[PDB]
Amino acid sequence: MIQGVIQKIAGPAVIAKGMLGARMYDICKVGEEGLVGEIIRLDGDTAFVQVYEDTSGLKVGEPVVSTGLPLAVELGPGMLNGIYDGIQRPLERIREKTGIYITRGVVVHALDREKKWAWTPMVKPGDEVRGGMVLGTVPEFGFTHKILVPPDVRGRVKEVKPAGEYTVEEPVVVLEDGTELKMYHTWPVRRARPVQRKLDPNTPFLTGMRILDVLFPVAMGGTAAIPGPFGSGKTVTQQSLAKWSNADVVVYVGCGERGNEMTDVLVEFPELTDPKTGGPLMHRTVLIANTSNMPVAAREASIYVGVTIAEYFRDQGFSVALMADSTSRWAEALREISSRLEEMPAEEGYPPYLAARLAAFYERAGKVITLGGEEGAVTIVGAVSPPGGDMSEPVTQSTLRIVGAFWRLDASLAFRRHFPAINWNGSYSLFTSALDPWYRENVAEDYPELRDAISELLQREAGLQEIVQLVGPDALQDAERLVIEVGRIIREDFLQQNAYHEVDAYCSMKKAYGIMKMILAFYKEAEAAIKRGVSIDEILQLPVLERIGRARYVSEEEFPAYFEEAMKEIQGAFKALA
Amino acid sequence: RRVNALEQVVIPGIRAQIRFIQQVLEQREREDTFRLKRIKGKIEAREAEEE
Amino acid sequence: LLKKEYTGITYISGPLLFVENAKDLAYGAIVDIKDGTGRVRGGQVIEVSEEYAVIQVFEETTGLDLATTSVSLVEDVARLGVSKEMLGRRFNGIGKPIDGLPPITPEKRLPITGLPLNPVARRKPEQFIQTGISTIDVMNTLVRGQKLPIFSGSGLPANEIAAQIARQATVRPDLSGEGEKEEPFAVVFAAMGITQRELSYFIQEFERTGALSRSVLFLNKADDPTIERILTPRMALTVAEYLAFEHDYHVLVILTDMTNYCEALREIGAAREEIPGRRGYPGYMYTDLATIYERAGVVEGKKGSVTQIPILSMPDDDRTHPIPDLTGYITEGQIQLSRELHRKGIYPPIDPLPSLSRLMNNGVGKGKTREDHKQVSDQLYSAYANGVDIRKLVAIIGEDALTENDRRYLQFADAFERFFINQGQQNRSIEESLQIAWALLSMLPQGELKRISKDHIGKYYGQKLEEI
Ligand SMILES: Nc1ncnc2c1ncn2[C@@H]1O[C@H](COP(=O)(O)OP(=O)(O)O)[C@@H](O)[C@H]1O
């Protein structure tokens, strides 16, 4: 292939000469250690290479070799229950060869080449196959892995291997033209995987949190963004989603964050239980980790690797959920590379093409009909870390123009330990109107009316909160004081949720429905009893308040018995009340 | 009541808004200075293309 | 080993100088610059190319000339010679002794930039440290392997708090039944941009405590070259990593006034005509700070640990300044001091609301300290927040529109700010602090403790105040 030598080294950027014939966005091996690079600019006889590894100690004159292929991942059996770096290398295999420190120049295979998989054929000689069809099945941790034809391969089957145990690199189907199909294939990370059609989402994505699943729902093919200041709850919210959501496969992308969180995920998850199959929680999870002290240029590649794996598991008919820990670090990596390229910054130092990249990343989500005729969906939840809580910085503004849901966090709620600290006034969701037919069939026919009543109460409470602070809480009439107290009850008893409690960490839909029924029944009884002349402070001393307060700590199996006792005590106490 | 309300609420918010606007304007001026430096560098580099 | 010199200097301007034929200088190497008078300067290669190599000088470039200056290579990577005998010594940040004693004999020579720790090789920090401060040990508890900075103002006594924490730190193995022995403790103290009046205080405190026999001090003064301020924390972290992961020490690293480090980094970045960030600071501070903070933690299969307590002064007490903002995104919590509490004589002036500890939930609980800790912390936070809100309401309206419930909450707030926070130079155990916390919670009636389960309010509730 095309081979050259290093001409200039400056930071993470290397300029090589003699590279006449190299193509844009191909993968190069730089130096005697074979560091992985990528071409981003061609100029005469020279080429501009960004390096995904540390460039310290390099010297001018070392060889540079081009591979002639773009950045691609390996897709096949063996990716579940694994942790990878930014360019899909197993860290647990790097450790056994290097030690407790990560060093450059290590080459490992993405899929284990020595494990035996139980092959089960599905096609016979004489059949004609196309892109996306199923050649066979291979068992995995409870799932059934389908061997898919590569999207750009078509032909007629000549022979099929019989049932047995083989490695991933042994050909199982040979086509008529001599093309050999294996259990794995490679796909460039910057190209979207084709589909037949895209469908409108109509089913909710149950996250396990009351405020997100009730007030601002997200659909099974939608996207959401969760901006917030430091110490606000973005990571705990995304790990709770990983633990408790109803997705089949969860892909976690830690672009440029702390290294202790990955240790927490690696330790806790093998001991937890998968909600919908009873196995260990780590059997359905794929981790891509690129910490903050890892090389900067690898932050960009990890996002593409994660979204490509999520797209691959979509083509098998699964429902996949994707979490990105921070996209601001990806923006910073783009800024650093553009600064090395001596390009003109647009705003805040960011390159002018940031919005195009962000739009291209978020567009890969949605509910589709796969090439094989199945149905799958991918949801993308991306966290944004604005500098100093400023919501006007370009990363947030470019994100708000494409996402369908916006979960805004507040530092004021985080200071007073009111978690999940979602600002219910600044947040919105555009999927609420399309999920109502599902709600009317699956929980109750009057659920949207109850939700609207709760939203109206919160709006009235927010309206009175401007009056109370500077006029005095005593100046309000009895109805207004009752509204204030009911709003406080809603805020403290329903919206609030503790992610570390043994019971409160997960909440079903019917439990939340019962809680809203309790709160609104209490409000109706109180507003009826106020007309009888009862003083407000006597109502705040009613013993039934503690029943509503302790309701969210009741377990899922014990909740229906508690609910009827509350539905009797609420009427009884207010009947005996003067 | 009005005296306390003004002194403890109204003034600090205005002061914070002023302090925010000043930083924004200073940042824009600094970016302008950087761009002027780059264009001066290009101007000086142009004259040496054929001496 | 032979030495090679280069004399083809072609351009000197500011901190940079260009060498013409230096094609065999590695990127990031350390060079040794000599002028005509024999004075020797240091420098680092920041860019290498076929036409020339760019070298920045660690200090000023006065006296250099193109006729007599020569550049000599030292090593391809900046390294520090470490040894187990460095304990009790003092160094000037660049690595030379300033205690007057002969230099050390290095066992190994380690790169000062370090290497990232593999997330697979890490393990969870779970060992709780008793510091003797109620506002820390109960509500912002510190775990071995945590990086917990202190956010301070200008005139606030952050350094006294750091010294008190260094004096009173203990691990309490009896609460978990982990024997009686102590795996040896060590302190690594690094000062960047410190003044003599302040440095004398730390020196005298260490001498009075007697902890100087197990401590290593790196001292960078205000008149030292600005580049030596950048290198100072890296060598301290290299020594701490070496000790902890090759000799099983439990080290504690204190970095003082990292605002000086950030201003030095801004100077160095602006000296090379780069695109600036939020307030003139370089746009790559996040990576540079992450390469310092992320070196602490605990490693699977090893007994040692590294604990970091950085100190930084907030400019104009602004929490949205780039330095505290970028520090918050990396470190695992922070302890913020309050000027209002310091004004009324409360010591230490730790403010509970903006303070945070992220590793609390896995270092306390059943079998670690006791069962009721986590719920007591939440109840204290909620009740104190309500008290602060009601007090804020009072200052505008007045003390006439308050229900007895609000009066109880104000009583809780003003009793808390006295009895719990202000402790002076005392050394409180965890049991004493939790007893005081349960005493304060007794002032509120039973039905309002929604955060605490009914078993615990049936057990510990009802104790009276004991400041008699
Ligand atoms: N639902 C929750 N329940 C309890 N604590 C929470 C919750 N969400 C966030 N926290 C608290 O927030 C702290 C850190 O928040 P984090 O997720 O790190 O925010 P960020 O990632 O933006 O820094 C944790 O120590 C945790 O105690």
Ligand SMILES: [Mg+2]
């Ligand atoms: Mg986080």
